[PDB]
Amino acid sequence: AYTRSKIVDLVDGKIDPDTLHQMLSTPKDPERFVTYVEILQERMPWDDKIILPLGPKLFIVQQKVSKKWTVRCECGHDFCDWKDNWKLSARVHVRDTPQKMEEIYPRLMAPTPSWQVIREYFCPECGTLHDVEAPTPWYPVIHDFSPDIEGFYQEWLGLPVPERAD
Amino acid sequence: LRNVQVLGIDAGGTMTDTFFVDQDGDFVVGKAQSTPQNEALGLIASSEDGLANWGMSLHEALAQLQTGVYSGTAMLNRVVQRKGLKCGLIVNRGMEDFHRMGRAVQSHLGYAYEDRIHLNTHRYDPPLVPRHLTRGVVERTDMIGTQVIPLREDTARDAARDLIAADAEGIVISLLHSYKNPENERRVRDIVLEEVEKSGKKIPVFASADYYPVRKETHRTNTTILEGYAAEPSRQTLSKISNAFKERGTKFDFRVMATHGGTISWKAKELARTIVSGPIGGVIGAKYLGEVLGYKNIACSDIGGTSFDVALITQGEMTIKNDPDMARLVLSLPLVAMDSVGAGAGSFIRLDPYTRAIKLGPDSAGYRVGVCWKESGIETVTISDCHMVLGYLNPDNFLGGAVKLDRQRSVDAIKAQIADPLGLSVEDAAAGVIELLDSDLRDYLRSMISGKGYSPASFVCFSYGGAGPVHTYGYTEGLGFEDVIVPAWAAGFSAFGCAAADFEYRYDKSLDINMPTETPDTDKEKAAATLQAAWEELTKNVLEEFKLNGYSADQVTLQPGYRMQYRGQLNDLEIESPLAQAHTAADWDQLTDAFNATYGRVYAASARSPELGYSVTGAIMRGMVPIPKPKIPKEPEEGETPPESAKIGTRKFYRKKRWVDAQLYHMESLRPGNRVMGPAVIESDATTFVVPDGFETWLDGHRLFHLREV
Ligand SMILES: [Zn+2]
């Protein structure tokens, strides 16, 4: 239903309130995903197809030649195969002292790092912060999302699955 | 011959309506373009138009008027479109933030069920007063007037100098619990007033205790800010009009319709009481009309030059909310429950540059009707321009043909702006705007009713915009109303409700009567004595103001009332006293018993908690004098076939991609009992009633029409 430029504004954080309320209060537009993902595609500097957005600067992607599925930054860096935790192949900054917590919180409003830690996760090439965790000491890294990509495209969207190698 | 006694007025964004009532109830109605920069000019013109139908001069009539009621829309519009004044605020230091925090509430005020829970829907509007025009004084007064932190007067002098320097255009002062002890807030006000004198600037000051001395500081401050923000521009208007009229020989003081449906004096400095005066005019006329004809459940629908106003009259009464919200603002003044959407005959038709979708309004053209009027200088097309293209309006009968409306201007400006950017004909360009509006108004009216828990078939729909009879078919089609009525005087319907308004004065005094359940009959008579006194103190106030208006005490009918509650509560109930006099023990038992009774009805018999004891919180006194109310016609009904005299030819009328030659009828030349099959337009001097093909109307003995689906 929605105008294409209006779903762009929504991505750019610039959409008007009337259409923002319209989008929220009425049944969703079945066409959203295919318009959305195409909007993201034309904003990448690499022509490999996008399969699913993982964050603002993070995607599951289909290699134009090998047809493998991978996690990719917007800049270009492939982290891992899509069934793996990308964070395992990323770089991490751990805020575990009052000095580091007091860089992003005023004292007293910072968590205490013997109870809670800030783990920031960056792309190796561009330094982009794709995710920040707030667990305890010892706590494993978290595999956020394992999507059923086949069922989504095939059963919920009525679309062929993109070609896939291993 | 004829003695003209009552005058009602709707000063609107487009037309200023006048409603004259004579001694026997007979009436006549005048229309004129508003002169919003000095509404006296349009008032005079409309008066002379209405009075000329009675072959009477404005001079001769004004000497005979005994009362008049003004209502309007200029202030309400200013609020809604946030076009008020650059106003600033001084509150208690350390709490400057409370205005802009909106008490959290105002991020979901007036939300339908579904959006109240849909969290991502909540949204804050801009604050009336931004943070850089707020300042704080160091003072603190507790819930019973004690000055815990005395006012450090220096901080008040810097507060004033700051906002004077910021070139604030009015300054509002709201200090906590000032309603209880206004000493500190009035010292601040005096200190501010002092600093504006030294500056040479013209900046008016508003102490909240001087205007709205009531608890809940977000409500009080919003309401007081309204006096600075929106009221001040139209403050000139009621003294310009009243001066122009006493100059001209009136012997009465004007009254104004106020938010609770009652009239107040034009002199009151609390103009915010009179903010929804125009719409409430319509609701009151529909209420009156219902009472004469036994319609107890009425849905009111008004379409003006700018918006579409809608309220429900449920079992003879309107609903009045105590601490209401309006335009997503908490307020301290009692309000009649209404609703609207911002579309009307002059709302501007624009296309989103990127979507190329039609957006109606929210602004309007007003007394300038649109492009169709050559001299209006209006370049953007308005819904009124689509009326001309489609054959809804008669080019040569706007205001009886006193106003030149050119259809080809409407056609060229519709083509260039709408039709050609959309690859449509001017016919389909205009018809799609009207069709969208028809559905938009219809879905709103259906939903306000659904929301309040009612079916549209439980109600009769009164329709009376002045431009609403142009879309009665539209927003009513298939809703299932019991009946849909277009009264013949639809165009001045609010000014009709204003001339119909009771001549009533009300007076209040608060109180501190605390009674346990078990009390001896001496504490019981003491309590009845002090309430008995307050009624007498109030009774002399009602009668003293009626004397200054030329009414002896014999003509005043008096109705005492009081406010009661269980002891520890926060809200109270108004109760009409069964006894005019109190005094003696058992009577205090009657007053409590009466309270209990209404508490059961208002809530539930098992809500009653007598063991908490009672608290009498105020006393009330009403004062009615008789007034000629407008007399509803009771004509003898005749044949269904209308006279050949009423036929005025045809116009090319375009609706569902079809052109038809729609009959034209002179409204006044129609007789009780006639029927009109669509397609036809019914025209008089200033009302156009549209009956498309697929509809039908008939006229009754009360000059009411009835829309049928058919
Ligand atoms: Zn990267």
For the residues of B137-205, what is the DSSP string, one character each? E--EE-TTS-EEE---HHHHHHHHHHHHHTT-SEEEEE-TTTTT--HHHHHHHHHHHHHHHHHT----E
Which pairs from B92-97 meet CB under 8 Å and 24+ separation? B92/B136, B92/B137, B92/B138, B92/B139, B92/B140, B92/B175, B92/B176, B93/B136, B93/B137, B93/B138, B93/B139, B93/B155, B94/B136, B95/B136, B95/B176, B96/B131, B96/B134, B96/B135, B96/B136, B97/B131
How far is residue B198 CA from its own chain's centroid?
A: 40
Which residue in A5, A17, A25 is closest to B115 by CB distance? A25
Q: Are B191 and B153 in contact (CB under 8 A)?
A: yes
Q: How far apart are CA B313 and CA B336, in angstroms?
A: 10
H/E run at residue B280: helix B277-293
Question: Is the link from the previous residue into B679 a cis peptide, with omega within 30 of 0?
Answer: yes
Span between the terminal Cα atoms of chain B, in Å: 46
H/E run at residue B427: helix B426-451
CB contact under 8 A, B123 and A17: yes
Q: How far apart are CA B514 and CA B565, in angstroms?
A: 10
Q: Whats the size of chain B, residue-wise?
A: 710
Q: Are B6 and B499 in contact (CB under 8 A)?
A: yes
CB contact under 8 A, A24 and B355: no
Span between the terminal Cα atoms of chain A, in Å: 37
Q: How far apart are CA B629 and CA B130, in angstroms?
A: 47
Q: What was the resolution (in A) of this experimentally determined structure?
A: 2.7
How far is residue B549 CA from its own chain's centroid?
A: 25
Q: How far apart are CA B393 and CA B407, in angstroms?
A: 9
Give which of B362, B358, B378, B361 is closest to B370, Cα–Cα.
Answer: B378
Please state, as a whole number, how many other Cβ atoms lie within 10 Å of the Cβ of residue B482. 15
CB contact under 8 A, B120 and A3: no
> How does strand B140-141 pair with strand B147-149?
antiparallel
Q: How far apart are CA B297 and CA B453, in angstroms?
A: 14
Please state, as a whole number, how many other Cβ atoms lie within 10 Å of the Cβ of residue B566. 18
Question: Chain A residues with CB inside 8 Å of B328's CB?
Answer: none
> The tokens of A118 are what?
């800030």
Question: Is the link from the previous residue into A124 a cis peptide, with omega within 30 of 0?
Answer: no
State in Å: Cα A162 to ligand 1 middle. Answer: 24
> The tokens of B106 are what?
């105002």
Q: What is the dihedral of CA B700, B701, B702, B708, to 10 degrees?
A: 0
CA distances to A126, B25, B225 from B203, in Å: 56, 46, 14
Please give the backbone phi and psi of residue B405, each rounded to the nearest 5 degrees, phi first.
Answer: -115, 120
CB contact under 8 A, A5 and B354: yes
H/E run at residue B6: strand B4-11
Q: How far apart are CA A68 and CA A88, in angstroms?
A: 19
How far is residue B641 CA from its own chain's centroid?
A: 40
Residues 6+ positions from B51 with CB-CB distance below 8 Å: B4, B20, B28, B30, B57, B58, B61
Q: How far apart are CA B224 and CA B163, in angstroms?
A: 17
Q: How far apart are CA B337 and CA B259, in angstroms?
A: 9
Nearest CA in chain B to A1: B355
CB contact under 8 A, B120 and A24: yes
State in Å: Cα A127 to ligand 1 middle. Answer: 6
Burial classification of residue B562, based on how many CB atoms lie within 10 Å of its CB (0-12 exposed, 13-18 middle, 19 or more buried): buried
> The tokens of A101 are what?
């917590």
CA distances to B5, B9, B70, B255, B412 from B61, in Å: 8, 15, 17, 18, 45
Residues 6+ positions from B532 with CB-CB distance below 8 Å: B581, B582, B583
Q: What is the dihedral of CA B605, B608, B610, B614, to 10 degrees?
A: -120
The nearest CA of chain A is from the CA of B320 a distance in Å of 29
Q: How far apart are CA B531 and CA B445, in angstroms?
A: 45
CA distances to A33, A51, A103, B68 from A64, in Å: 21, 12, 42, 82
The nearest CA of chain A is from the CA of B121 a distance in Å of 7
Q: How far apart are CA B220 and CA A6, in angstroms?
A: 40
Q: How far apart are CA A16 and CA B484, in angstroms?
A: 38
CA atoms within 13 A on the CB side of B597: 11
Please state, as a whole number, how many other Cβ atoms lie within 10 Å of the Cβ of residue B4. 23
Q: How far apart are CA B674 and CA B696, in angstroms?
A: 11
Q: Are B151 and B112 in contact (CB under 8 A)?
A: no
Q: Are B370 and B404 in contact (CB under 8 A)?
A: no
Q: How was this structure determined?
A: X-ray
CA torsion sign, B454 to B460 to B464 to B468? positive
Please give the backbone phi and psi of residue B153, each rounded to the nearest 5 degrees, phi first.
Answer: -50, -20
Q: How far apart are CA B3 and CA B25, in angstroms?
A: 10
H/E run at residue B541: helix B523-548
Q: Are B682 and B665 in contact (CB under 8 A)?
A: yes
According to DSSP, residue B215 is labeled S
Burial classification of residue B157, based on how many CB atoms lie within 10 Å of its CB (0-12 exposed, 13-18 middle, 19 or more buried): middle
3-class SS letters over B176-191: CCCCCCCHHHHHHHHH
Which residue in A6, A24, A25 is closest to B355 by CB distance? A6
Nearest CA in chain A to B357: A3
Nearest CA in chain B to A7: B355
Q: How far apart are CA B7 and CA B425, in angstroms?
A: 47
Burial classification of residue B663, based on how many CB atoms lie within 10 Å of its CB (0-12 exposed, 13-18 middle, 19 or more buried): buried
Which residue in A3, A17, A24 is closest to B355 by CB distance? A3
Which pairs from B161-168 meet CB under 8 Å and 24+ separation? B161/B195, B162/B135, B163/B88, B163/B90, B163/B133, B163/B135, B163/B203, B164/B195, B164/B196, B164/B199, B164/B201, B164/B203, B166/B88, B166/B132, B166/B133, B167/B86, B167/B201, B168/B86, B168/B87, B168/B88, B168/B133, B168/B203
After which residues are there C–N gaps above 2.5 Å in chain A?
Answer: none
Ramachandran area for residue B315 (φ above 0: left; ψ -120 to 50: alpha; else beta): left
> How does strand B460-463 pair with strand B483-487?
parallel
Q: Are B100 and B108 in contact (CB under 8 A)?
A: no
Beta bridge partners of A73: A58
Give which of B615, B513, B621 is closest to B572, Cα–Cα.
Answer: B615
Q: Are B158 and B147 in contact (CB under 8 A)?
A: no
Residue matched to tokens 């006229």: B699
> The tokens of B510 are what?
């608060």
Q: How far apart are CA B674 and CA B670, in angstroms?
A: 7
Give which of B465, B301, B328 is closest to B383, Cα–Cα.
Answer: B465
> The tokens of B21 are what?
């009532």
Alpha-helical (H) ranges within B578-638 are 586-602
**CA angle, corner B606, sides to B600 and B612, nearest 5?**
85
Give which of B351, B352, B354, B414 is closest to B378, Cα–Cα.
Answer: B414
The helix/strand/coil state of A128 is coil
Residues 6+ positions from A110 with CB-CB distance below 8 Å: A98, A101, A102, A104
Residues 6+ positions from B606 with CB-CB distance below 8 Å: none
For chain A, which residues lie within 8 Å of any Cβ of chain B, measuring from their own Cβ? 3, 5-6, 17, 21, 24-25
Please state, as a whole number, how many other Cβ atoms lie within 10 Å of the Cβ of residue B654. 21
Nearest CA in chain B to A23: B121
Q: Are B18 and B77 in contact (CB under 8 A)?
A: no
> The tokens of B145 are what?
């007037």
Amino acid present at A135: P
Give which of B70, B85, B122, B435 is closest to B239, Cα–Cα.
Answer: B70
Q: Are B32 and B40 in contact (CB under 8 A)?
A: no
Q: What is the dihedral of CA B665, B668, B673, B675, to 10 degrees?
A: 10
Burial B75-102 (b: 16+ CB within 10 A, else e): bbbbbbbeebbebbbbbbbebeebbbeb
The nearest CA of chain B is from the CA of A25 a distance in Å of 7
How far is residue B470 CA from its own chain's centroid?
A: 22
Q: Are B693 and B652 in contact (CB under 8 A)?
A: no
Give which of B393, B370, B378, B381 is closest to B433, Cα–Cα.
Answer: B381
Please state, as a whole number, how many other Cβ atoms lie within 10 Å of the Cβ of residue B606. 7
> The tokens of B48 are what?
């002379």
Q: Are B200 and B258 in contact (CB under 8 A)?
A: no
Please state, as a whole number, how many other Cβ atoms lie within 10 Å of the Cβ of residue B625. 19
Q: Are B680 and B691 in contact (CB under 8 A)?
A: yes
According to DSSP, residue B672 is labeled T
Radius of gyration from C-alpha coordinates of chain A: 19
> The tokens of B332 are what?
């301290």
Q: Which of A10, A16, A25, A26 to mutate to test the interface with B (most CBs of B within 10 A)?
A: A25
The nearest CA of chain A is from the CA of B356 a distance in Å of 10
Question: Chain B residues with CB inside 8 Å of A5's CB?
Answer: 354-355
Q: Are B159 and B174 in contact (CB under 8 A)?
A: no
Burial classification of residue A108, based on how many CB atoms lie within 10 Å of its CB (0-12 exposed, 13-18 middle, 19 or more buried): exposed
Amino acid present at B305: G
**CA angle, corner B590, sides to B587 and B591, nearest 5?**
95
The residues whose Cβ lies within 5 A of ligand 1, an ion, are A 73, 75, 77, 123, 125-126
Q: How far apart are CA A109 and CA B709, in angstroms?
A: 67
> The tokens of B388 are what?
């001309």
Residues 6+ positions from B371 with CB-CB distance below 8 Å: B378, B379, B380, B381, B382, B385, B409, B410, B413
